[PDB]
RNA sequence: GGGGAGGUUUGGCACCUCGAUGUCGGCUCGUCGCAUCCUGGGGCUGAAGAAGGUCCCAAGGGUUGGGCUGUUCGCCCAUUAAAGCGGCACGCGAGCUGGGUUCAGAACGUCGUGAGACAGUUCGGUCUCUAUCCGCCACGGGCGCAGGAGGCUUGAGGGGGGCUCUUCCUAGUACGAGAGGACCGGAAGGGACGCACCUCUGGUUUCCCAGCUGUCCCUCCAGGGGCAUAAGCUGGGUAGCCAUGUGCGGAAGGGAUAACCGCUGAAAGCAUCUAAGCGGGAAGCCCGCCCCAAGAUGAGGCCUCCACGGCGUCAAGCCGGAAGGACCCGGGAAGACCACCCGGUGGAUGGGCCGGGGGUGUAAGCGCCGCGAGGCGUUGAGCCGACCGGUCCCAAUCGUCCGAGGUCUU
RNA sequence: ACCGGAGCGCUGUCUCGGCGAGGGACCCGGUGAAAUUGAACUGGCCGUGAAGAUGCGGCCUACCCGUGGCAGGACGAAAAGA
RNA sequence: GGUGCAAGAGCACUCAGGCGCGCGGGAGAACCCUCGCCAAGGAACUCUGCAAGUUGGCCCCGUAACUUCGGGAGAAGGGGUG
């Protein structure tokens, strides 16, 4: 139920009697490293692995805390709970039936230090009836003398953007076994060339 | 697909071809109107010899100077506006409609007497 | 939100052309100059581009360099002393180095720019 | 119009200023000679990286 | 290895060969033939003769916005490698660069002055 | 006729503020309560059906756009499931406006011998750049978690999100003389709102390509440059950033209960839902779904790399790591500075160069046609900002400093 | 260059916002002020107190310092209430 | 002073002749000032179409109520310009 992935593009091809609108994502074959089930922990997972960055730029504790199951050398390693794998490699063609419903986790695009009008959508002052040096920044932040303080849930200008976000319940229209591409109708967040993990949740029923 | 307060032609009955839009007529804050959307309207330019003189009516919106991103993605737009006049449930004031042809103005599908009678080029 | 859009700004939007074409008349004349380092790490996209059309040949090159230098002595020097000598080399003709003294009075580090043998 | 109130202490005047201390530079020796130098520049007594370019011909 | 290498693996089972209609031109008059199909599974191959107005490219082309003057001007963009069409047939070639995105002819509606190009 | 709660209304009394506690409306942002306007769960009828009347529980979610007047209020046109009542110094002016009334000017009516005057009317009238401390929104620097480091992580706790309608199978039957017309279930599309993203439809793109006018200069014709918005004016526009564009969402389940309805059943061997026991029951509570989170002084949990040697019995004092690491440089879909991420020649990290994608739209020159403005062939050419790549041609040359010598005990 | 109503022509005043350029703000070198001020080792809610508490009472929360920002409080500032 | 604008001491370049305004260098966030376009709809914003945008020079044709016979008139509304 799992895949470590690199997003590339959104691009559309006519599939049925209309034209759908998919994305195009890749998973070249992740090798599991550690598996951790019963006695001492509960966070049970096979840990996958990414692409191949040139062995001698690598320090010794991820040399031999990585040889113990003998992959080669990663950049990225991750962990998603409650899965069992029978052997030493997971591949695209095993898990995903073409026709399921899947979901996608990735980091967003970081917009920087965006203001109020971007971050919480709410309007500003007017523009041509006398609008002396306010046009876009908020109104009040409280009420006089009975609290004596401003609340601590309050929307305000500040940072924005590159958090962890997820999308839900989008389908898996057609995969290719020859390559290791995968096609999903939807949005699939992130600046492309960035990491995306894919798990399945069809347990949402009707 | 934009009708808060607009003039649009009638291509039909009255005595002249103006109208005012008042209110889009689905639930409680609808704010816009694409085609196939019955809107309540006010007749504004004069009517010689008399049918609909200066009351207010309801009309089905036909083409709209904006894009229909159609299901296989062509997109028919025009450059005009209109709407056909509807008596208190669903009919027409006469059996003649003169605007501009098919390309599927049918697409509310409570209206077939318009698209059987929306003849040909002009 | 500067986001995948290169070629940094310095001055103004038409003072920059008269900065480029006024420091490109001096480097071709003297062989070496001395500027500030953010003014030097970007001049080599322009000065290196003129000398590529130099060795290309004909009057459709020496009429096109002339709209960037406007000197009928600099072009008839450029098309026969520095243009023949690079008929063994695919680009990358300049060289910018750092220099170990600040500019007291406003404290900006310097750079040494010259075209290579 | 946004004027202050009570003047700050010595003990909190001199606690903001705790964080303004500045760092020494970074120096390495010129290898052709025997002195210091900022470690990515041309050396203004011994001459070069590989090929002179400076210093009083 | 990125999109330039393996999204032309994906789209080349559809536009491996585009079912080759020929020579778009820029300002020519055309009659399309589409497969408008509705009304409990009835297809109705519809033809439309029309003046072409603009096109733009990146291998998901649109042989796009196409106008003709019924008496109210109706104008109809459309995909070029799509499965909708049978064939595109041109009638005659026209000229006058001022290339893609000609749109004077929306408001210069006089058909006496459309034929003076 | 009698008994009370509430502090939202015009009052009563004068206790802090006259070496100053800036007004009624309008914007912008809100959180709260219930004597509930809609959604949901129930008893009673002068409830046949569909609709209705009044009462008991219930605060999750929602409460539209306009004409007149300074208006809060009120009367109206068009819809809707409805178009709620109240507090928060009659919330909010070191956040904005100045229409209202009572600052200096002037006039109409009316009282006065007169200066003047009248909650009687009417037209004009200055609203202040720098946040010291609590409070809030985001990011950092030290010593801590008893050898020194890297990596992946569990969750105490806390936040966000919670809507609603219409048509159609059931079926037009049960119901009722008829006219009318359902409970329970079952499908589809739509409205407002929220988190992401560029392929379509649309928008910007300060120098990417062309055209045109005036005037000084390159050298006279040709061909070019500077200036006439911090672009001279007009027709186009890639990546980037967004919406008037596309994708999905709000649940299914599990428990415990509210008003209500029961099962056995005593004290009360004709009975009764009870304090002995057990069961049914809502958009409301807890768990479930995403997101931060061991700074949870209760300082968490695992796997891997180096522990070589000493010693005069005080050893918290030296150089010192295949551990590891900052300062320095070439950078970036990360960024106010630091922070994070990817590189440092056994390199493809940026600049140039080559091959594409993509913009404009048929270059200068010579040869033909016309007395001249021009036209026609070479020619879908030439110029080419960042998108995807191959290529030691130019740049990251050389180097420098801190860090265990695992403690109380057997 | 007066004051009150109504139409037409065109429009970012608006439904409802979006992108772009220059002068500041941000960082680094040079010089470098002013109104204000009892002393400060300056948390939240219930309640009392000359009757709107960071200084008193009982419980919950909080590791030592700083840099950009937004304006609720200090019955904030100025003017011995017109 | 010299050219092109129907004219001119106006507007646009520019002769002689002066000057670049006595703090600099980088990055290119929120927010404010001075600007440029936008689409579908054109006053729905508002105390008030406030502000901004529309037509804008010269020539020809044509021109209403009322009037103290001058005027209303640049009425309105149209075509031309290399």
Swiss-Prot record, chain B:
PROSITE patterns the UniProt entry points to: RIBOSOMAL_L14
Q: Where are the transmembrane segments?
A: none
Could you say which residues form the signal peptide? none
Q: Which UniProt keywords apply?
A: Ribonucleoprotein, Ribosomal protein, RNA-binding, rRNA-binding
Instruction: Return the GO cellular component terms, semicolon-separated.
Output: cytosolic large ribosomal subunit
The family line of this record is:
Belongs to the universal ribosomal protein uL14 family.
Put simply, this protein is called Large ribosomal subunit protein uL14
At the highest ranks, the source species' classification is:
Bacteria, Thermotogati, Deinococcota, Deinococci, Thermales
UniProtKB/Swiss-Prot annotation, chain C:
Q: Which InterPro entries match?
A: Ribosomal_bL17, Ribosomal_bL17_sf
Q: Does Transmembrane show up as a keyword for this record?
A: no
Q: Which GO terms are recorded in the biological process aspect for this UniProt protein?
A: translation
Q: Does the keyword Transcription apply?
A: no
Q: Which UniProt keywords apply?
A: Ribonucleoprotein, Ribosomal protein
Q: Which Pfam families match?
A: Ribosomal_L17
- Give me the segments passing through the membrane: none
Molecular function in Gene Ontology: structural constituent of ribosome
Organism superkingdom: Bacteria
- Subunit architecture: Part of the 50S ribosomal subunit. Contacts protein L32.
Family classification: Belongs to the bacterial ribosomal protein bL17 family.
Q: Which HAMAP family match?
A: Ribosomal_bL17 (MF_01368)
Q: What is this protein's record name?
A: Large ribosomal subunit protein bL17
Q: Which organism is it from?
A: Thermus thermophilus (strain ATCC 27634 / DSM 579 / HB8)
List the gene name. Answer: rplQ
Curated annotation (Swiss-Prot), chain D:
Recorded GO cellular component terms are: large ribosomal subunit
Q: State where composition is biased (Basic residues).
A: 1-20
Disulfide bond annotation, renumbered to this chain: none
- What does the record list as GO biological process? translation
Annotated spans, Disordered: 1-27
Family matches, as InterPro entries: Ribosomal_bL32 (IPR002677), Ribosomal_bL32_bact (IPR044957), Ribosomal_zn-bd (IPR011332)
Q: How does it assemble?
A: Part of the 50S ribosomal subunit.
Q: Which PANTHER family match?
A: 50S RIBOSOMAL PROTEIN L32 (PTHR35534), LARGE RIBOSOMAL SUBUNIT PROTEIN BL32 (PTHR35534:SF1)
What is its biological role? Found on the solvent side of the large subunit.
Report the protein name in the record.
Answer: Large ribosomal subunit protein bL32
Write down the species: Thermus thermophilus (strain ATCC 27634 / DSM 579 / HB8)
List the lineage, top down.
Answer: Bacteria, Thermotogati, Deinococcota, Deinococci, Thermales
Swiss-Prot record, chain E:
Work out whether the entry's keyword set contains Oxidoreductase. no
Gene Ontology cellular component terms for the protein in this record = cytosolic large ribosomal subunit
GO MF terms held by the record: rRNA binding; structural constituent of ribosome
GO annotation, biological process:
translation
The reply on keyword Ribonucleoprotein is yes
Keywords from the UniProt entry? Ribonucleoprotein, Ribosomal protein, RNA-binding, rRNA-binding
User: The organism sits in which domain of life?
Assistant: Bacteria
What does the sequence similarity comment in the record state about its family?
Belongs to the bacterial ribosomal protein bL19 family.
Described by its record, this protein's role is as follows: Contacts the 16S rRNA of the 30S subunit (part of bridge B6), connecting the 2 subunits.
* Name the UniProt record assigns to this protein: Large ribosomal subunit protein bL19
Q: What is the lineage of its organism?
A: Bacteria, Thermotogati, Deinococcota, Deinococci, Thermales
Quote the range of the complete protein represented. 1 to 117 of 146
